Amino acid sequence: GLMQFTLPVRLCKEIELFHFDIGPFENMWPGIFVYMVHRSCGTSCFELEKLCRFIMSVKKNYRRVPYHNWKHAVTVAHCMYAILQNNHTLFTDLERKGLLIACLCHDLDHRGFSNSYLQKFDHPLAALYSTSTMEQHHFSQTVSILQLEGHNIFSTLSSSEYEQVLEIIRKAIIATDLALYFGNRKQLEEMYQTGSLNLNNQSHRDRVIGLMMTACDLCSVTKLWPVTKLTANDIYAEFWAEGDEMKKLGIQPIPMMDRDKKDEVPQGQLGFYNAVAIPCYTTLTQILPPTEPLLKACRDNLSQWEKVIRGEE
Template sequence: LHGSSILERHHLEFGKTLLRDESLNIYQNLSRRQHDTVIHLMDIAIIATDLALYFKKRTMFQKIVDQSKTYENWNDWTKAMMMTACDLSAIAKPWEIQSKVALAVAAEFWEQGDLERTVLEQTPIPMMDRNKSDELPKMQCGFIDFVCAFVYKEFSRFHVEITPMLERLLNNRKEWNALKEVYEGKLAAIEGAKIAKEEEAAAKQAAAAAQSQSKTCIVG
């Protein structure tokens, strides 16, 4: 039915279906022109929640920010990027809030991963694998770097009042990175202890072999 943004287009069409019910149509008192404008804004806002489109539009949005004083017809692009910024806004909350939201979202992912493992007998992707929960800080750093940072950096250039959100995002990146380094330090310590144990065992085995060879030579 829909070639792209399938879930988002389903949401949009279902929303329009609900609006056909007079008891639910909150736009019924608008003029035809106002109604068309609102529906157009709905189209932009809902379809823009598809992150795949966000990645495709980033270069154009950067160009708009670079030429914001002279660029024409940038409103729809900016509104679409604003929806992405809103969708991702938990990442720009104070650390005390952001960390809780991240854990809550991760818990939902892990529940889905549990179902994939037990019901579908499939190995879930790392993000949904409860067995990899210790890697959450690393995943959050990647999420910030590859998904979130761009939109807040560009919007902070576009409007200075967005800067506090960018600053909180960067602070959250530092917090997650600190947790990531703690975990990586533990892994390194475990790996170091394992290697030391293997080297000790190898040394003992070599010493035993040398001693055995020495006894053989004496007997001979």
């Protein structure tokens, strides 16, 4: 009850900022998360003995892949933490609990391959789930861990609060399938401008949480340039591996994934920012004004990639 987590001053200050980088020390990331849960949710939200056991089981089930790893899980959680703190009163007690956990769990047991690569490989998980493949696998894994003895961090909730929080988390994790982002934003877009967006409409909240998750999941583009620049190497390390494996199946990969075509990256990142990230954070800022900082950083980094092409770095 009385065992606050505290952080070094720089971390304690910098963590409340959208563009915070959790840093290269694996060993602090668990404490960082618990810090965020206590300030986001309450020191009463979860039994600490239990939370710690869940955190470490969840860490154990992210794999050693260049990008879709434990560092990604916590990065995404922090970005959600930042959004909840800047929109304090808009979100229910359970929405605060379930969302941070969803973010922590959103990529459980990712292998570094896209849904497309499961289908073309004919991986068993593509047999089992025909769309949002990995994402239903990550939700599947989150319930597996939640059901291990001593890991039910949600046990103090009623039967029905429990059914709501798992249902928040499921949609939350499906929402991170970028295949669904495009329709979800276009629907939120029409609803904000026609002016029918109603946050008391639960099908509306669902979409808005869906956008937040896309925004959190994309937040390596909302960092200081030197972070965004270096994280790009990791996402691209996975892409080129997947390309290598597409080549092995007798399939030319999209250039984005072809390591013979690195020259084409700065242009590929241009497309990405314009088609995906700028729109994501635009629509999110229009809905949740305090989240503007994420749009500014995104824009900044777009500018930096233009600069890369112009020979200027």
